Every structure is written in structure tokens, then in C-alpha cells.
């Protein structure tokens, strides 16, 4: 009763009784406040100028098409894996930023993305290279030769993507959206390609916060 408990079962039995005594959740009203640290967040994509935003029906057809491409890429990886070219195609070391840029893009004129060449590319490399090409893209104009490489390397990325890969391809799609603002006719060469890459990233690779939603 009012003598100390003498076993732990008794003690605990007593705490439990005392537990119900107490209100199970309590809320102290306070009175004021202050400032709080900002968490910096990256922008989405820039919407297309009016008229330049592609239709959903185009976007979906593009995605559907890209999937097939990827089916076929992987479906024949091993055939193209065993072929060659020459002293010609030395595939740079996986971490030679500069020589990959020179490899794919040139000032020679640069090797295009042949299955024979990209099928030899392991996942960490495809990732790295994409990056090298992202970088080169921030600091140079978008050529159609760049387009093909990006599209190719995108056709060789395997899901599920690692988070850094998602972050990378998102960065690229932001950059496409930004360059797209510079444009001034629909007739511009960049337009179809930039819309295309934004699509594949936003709709093929699940970043739909970045997608061009028309209207």
C-alpha cells in the first residue's frame, strides 16, 4: 500500500497504475517565434514559349517509340559487343572528360554513337559520359551531333536508375528548357530535339514534374 515495492513486477505494476493517472498526450500552449533556415531547391523546367509546347499525343507516341528502341538496343547488345573498328576508335578511359568530349564531338570531327561503340559501354561509363556531355552543353551550343549522343546514351541507361543518374538527366532537361527560350522561330533546328529530350526525361524516366503539360 504505502510501503515501498519489493519486487520489480510490483514496481512496474505501480508505474502502470501511475501511467493511467497521467493524460496520455499533453500540449503546452506557449506564447511568442523567429526566422528559419532556407532549404534551397532546384527549379523545374522552364515552360516552352507559347506555341512551342508539344501535344500530349506527340509526347506519348515519342515515349512509346523510345521504349522499342531500348528493347532493341539491349536485345542486340552482345552481337555489337563483338566486332571492332581500328586504332581509330580508342574508347577513352572512363574518366577522361576531355577525351570523351573530343571522342564524341571532335573540334577530328568526332565519332557518332554506333551500337558497335555504345553497346561496349558499361553503365558507369554511360552515366559519366552523359555528364561530360551535360557539361559541354552548358558551355557550348547544342549541335545535332550532341542530340544523337544524349539520345543514345539515354537509350543505353538501364532502369532502375540510381539517384545520381536521375539528378543528372534532370539537370540536362532543365538546360534544354533554358536554351529553348533563346529560340525565335519554330523553324529553329534545336526545337524538336530539345522538346524530345525533355519528354524522355519527364515521361520515359519518371520525372513528370519536369514534363511539358500543354495549355
Amino acid at each position: 500500500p504505502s510501503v515501498p515495492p519489493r519486487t520489480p513486477q510490483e514496481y512496474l505494476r505501480r508505474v502502470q497504475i501511475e501511467a493511467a493517472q497521467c493524460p496520455d498526450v499533453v500540449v503546452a500552449q506557449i506564447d511568442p517565434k523567429r526566422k528559419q533556415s532556407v532549404n534551397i531547391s532546384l527549379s523545374g523546367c522552364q515552360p516552352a514559349p507559347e506555341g512551342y509546347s508539344p501535344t500530349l499525343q506527340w509526347q506519348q507516341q515519342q515515349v512509346a517509340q523510345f521504349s522499342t528502341v531500348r528493347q532493341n538496343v539491349n536485345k542486340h547488345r552482345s552481337h555489337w559487343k563483338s566486332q571492332q573498328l581500328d586504332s581509330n576508335v580508342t574508347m577513352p578511359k572512363s574518366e577522361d572528360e576531355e577525351g570523351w568530349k573530343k571522342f564524341c564531338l571532335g573540334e577530328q570531327i568526332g565519332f557518332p554513337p554506333l551500337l558497335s561503340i555504345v553497346s561496349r559501354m558499361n553503365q558507369a561509363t554511360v552515366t559519366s559520359v552523359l555528364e561530360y556531355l551535360s557539361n559541354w552543353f552548358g558551355e557550348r551550343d547544342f549541335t545535332p551531333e550532341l542530340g544523337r549522343w544524349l539520345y543514345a546514351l539515354l537509350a543505353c541507361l538501364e532502369k532502375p536508375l540510381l539517384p545520381e543518374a536521375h539528378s543528372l538527366i534532370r539537370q540536362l532537361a532543365r538546360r534544354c528548357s533554358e536554351v529553348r527560350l533563346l529560340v525565335d522561330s519554330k523553324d529553329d533546328e534545336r526545337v524538336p530535339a530539345l522538346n524530345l529530350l525533355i519528354c524522355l526525361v519527364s515521361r520515359y524516366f519518371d520525372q513528370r514534374d519536369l514534363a511539358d503539360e500543354p495549355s
Binding site: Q62, V69, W80, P112, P113
Partner: peptide
């Protein structure tokens, strides 16, 4: 068909008519 990606690129850039 060692340039079949290169072709699918060109083909999709081309699919654009707006």
C-alpha cells in the same frame, strides 16, 4: 545496322510537326 540509334533520333526529331 550499326547506326540504328542515329536513325531513330533523326526519325523522332523529324516526327515533330506543329
Amino acid at each position: 545496322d550499326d547506326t540504328a540509334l542515329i536513325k531513330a533520333y533523326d526519325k523522332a526529331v523529324a516526327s515533330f510537326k506543329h
